[PDB]
Design a protein around this motif. Structure first.
Motif, PDB file in Angstrom:
ATOM      1  N   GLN A 271     -10.842 -11.905  -0.418  1.00  0.00           N
ATOM      2  CA  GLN A 271     -11.226 -11.392   0.855  1.00  0.00           C
ATOM      3  C   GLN A 271     -10.095 -10.518   1.401  1.00  0.00           C
ATOM      4  O   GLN A 271     -10.088 -10.061   2.569  1.00  0.00           O
ATOM      5  CB  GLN A 271     -11.627 -12.457   1.867  1.00  0.00           C
ATOM      6  CG  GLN A 271     -12.840 -13.284   1.317  1.00  0.00           C
ATOM      7  CD  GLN A 271     -13.313 -14.531   1.948  1.00  0.00           C
ATOM      8  OE1 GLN A 271     -14.124 -15.268   1.342  1.00  0.00           O
ATOM      9  NE2 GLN A 271     -12.889 -14.810   3.183  1.00  0.00           N
ATOM     10  N   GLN A 272      -9.100 -10.332   0.532  1.00  0.00           N
ATOM     11  CA  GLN A 272      -7.883  -9.566   0.881  1.00  0.00           C
ATOM     12  C   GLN A 272      -7.716  -8.406  -0.074  1.00  0.00           C
ATOM     13  O   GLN A 272      -8.093  -8.552  -1.262  1.00  0.00           O
ATOM     14  CB  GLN A 272      -6.681 -10.486   0.992  1.00  0.00           C
ATOM     15  CG  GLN A 272      -7.013 -11.780   1.722  1.00  0.00           C
ATOM     16  CD  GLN A 272      -7.072 -11.592   3.223  1.00  0.00           C
ATOM     17  OE1 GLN A 272      -7.572 -12.488   3.908  1.00  0.00           O
ATOM     18  NE2 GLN A 272      -6.571 -10.495   3.677  1.00  0.00           N
TER      19      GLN A 272
ATOM     20  N   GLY B  76      -5.357  -9.740  -2.652  1.00  0.00           N
ATOM     21  CA  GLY B  76      -5.730 -11.115  -3.069  1.00  0.00           C
ATOM     22  C   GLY B  76      -5.458 -11.459  -4.513  1.00  0.00           C
ATOM     23  O   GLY B  76      -5.060 -12.630  -4.759  1.00  0.00           O
TER      24      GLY B  76
ATOM     25  N   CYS C  35     -10.066  -6.028  -4.395  1.00  0.00           N
ATOM     26  CA  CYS C  35      -9.000  -6.975  -4.123  1.00  0.00           C
ATOM     27  C   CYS C  35      -7.872  -7.042  -5.149  1.00  0.00           C
ATOM     28  O   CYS C  35      -6.897  -7.808  -4.938  1.00  0.00           O
ATOM     29  CB  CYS C  35      -9.760  -8.368  -4.175  1.00  0.00           C
ATOM     30  SG  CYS C  35     -11.163  -8.669  -3.058  1.00  0.00           S
TER      31      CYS C  35
END
Ligand SMILES: [Hg+2]
Ligand SMILES: [Zn+2]
Length: 255
Positions: free
Chosen positions: A131-132, A135, A201
């Motif tokens: 979600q980053q 990530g 990500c």
């Protein structure tokens, strides 16, 4: 979603519109266009205390899963900030030795490509990591056909056991260090997963130097099944995605 004529890469955008995003993978690595960045630190791979758990046929590939409840097998340094824990590894292979790799070098395609997936531990779980923008961290290794790779046989021998989709087998005390090349020279660029959900990500780290595996080794991969047990047999071959638009992005060289 698959790699067939009807559900292949050209159709992924329908269910996953990010397919046409701004930082999709894989890409073509133009060796003359890539930027030698002197501010790049050396890769730091600590897989000494790695714990392999099992091998599973998920219908698009075989994954070797690792225990990632603790900093057992970590990736750090390089272009990365923080620690990334290895969760699994998989491969992408062709039907022939002239295709298979996801990433290309000056358009050159390899017989296979090894990806070791790592997740940034400041995010706490793999689920939160995806979600980053930073990530995950993927370690990419090209496989060429030549000499047999002693360190890969353990895997090769167990594939008879996970022929079809859904099958899994115990697979402990497997040391990943056996899959690494001599040199840690790499290319890095901001990218994505190369399979649905094609999330953007990933910090891709592609090693310059390939590992060689024997023809009989890669041949065992091609004997796998996409299909589930007791269904029409569909050989697990060409489970790779074509190179995508770099689109502004810059590829840096550690060398
Ligand atoms: Hg993301
Ligand atoms: Zn992959």
């Amino acid at each position: 979603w698959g790699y067939g004529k009807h559900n292949g890469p050209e159709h992924w955008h329908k269910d996953f519109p990010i397919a046409k995003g701004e930082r999709q993978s894989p890409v073509d690595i133009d060796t003359h266009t890539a930027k030698y960045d002197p501010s790049l630190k050396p890769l730091s791979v600590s897989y000494d205390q790695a714990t392999s758990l099992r091998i599973l046929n998920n219908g698009h590939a075989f994954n070797v899963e690792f225990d990632d409840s603790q900093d057992k097998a970590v990736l750090k340094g390089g272009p990365l900030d923080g620690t990334y824990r290895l969760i699994q590894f998989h491969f992408h292979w062709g039907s022939l030795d002239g295709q298979g790799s996801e990433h290309t070098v000056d358009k050159k395609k390899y017989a296979a490509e090894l990806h070791l997936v790592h997740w940034n531990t400041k995010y706490g779980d793999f689920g939160k990591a995806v979600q980053q923008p930073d990530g995950l961290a993927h370690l990419g290794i090209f496989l060429k056909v030549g000499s047999a790779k002693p360190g890969l046989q353990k895997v090769v021998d167990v594939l008879d056991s996970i022929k079809t989709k859904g099958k899994s087998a115990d697979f402990t005390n497997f040391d990943p260090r056996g899959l690494l090349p001599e040199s840690l020279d790499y290319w890095t660029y901001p990218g994505s997963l190369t399979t649905p959900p094609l999330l953007e990500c990933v910090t891709w780290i592609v090693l310059k130097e390939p590992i060689s595996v024997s023809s009989e080794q890669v041949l065992k991969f091609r004997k796998l099944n996409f299909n589930g047990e007791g269904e029409p047999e569909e050989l697990m071959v060409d489970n790779w995605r074509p190179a995508q638009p770099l689109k502004n992005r810059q590829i840096k060289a550690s060398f």
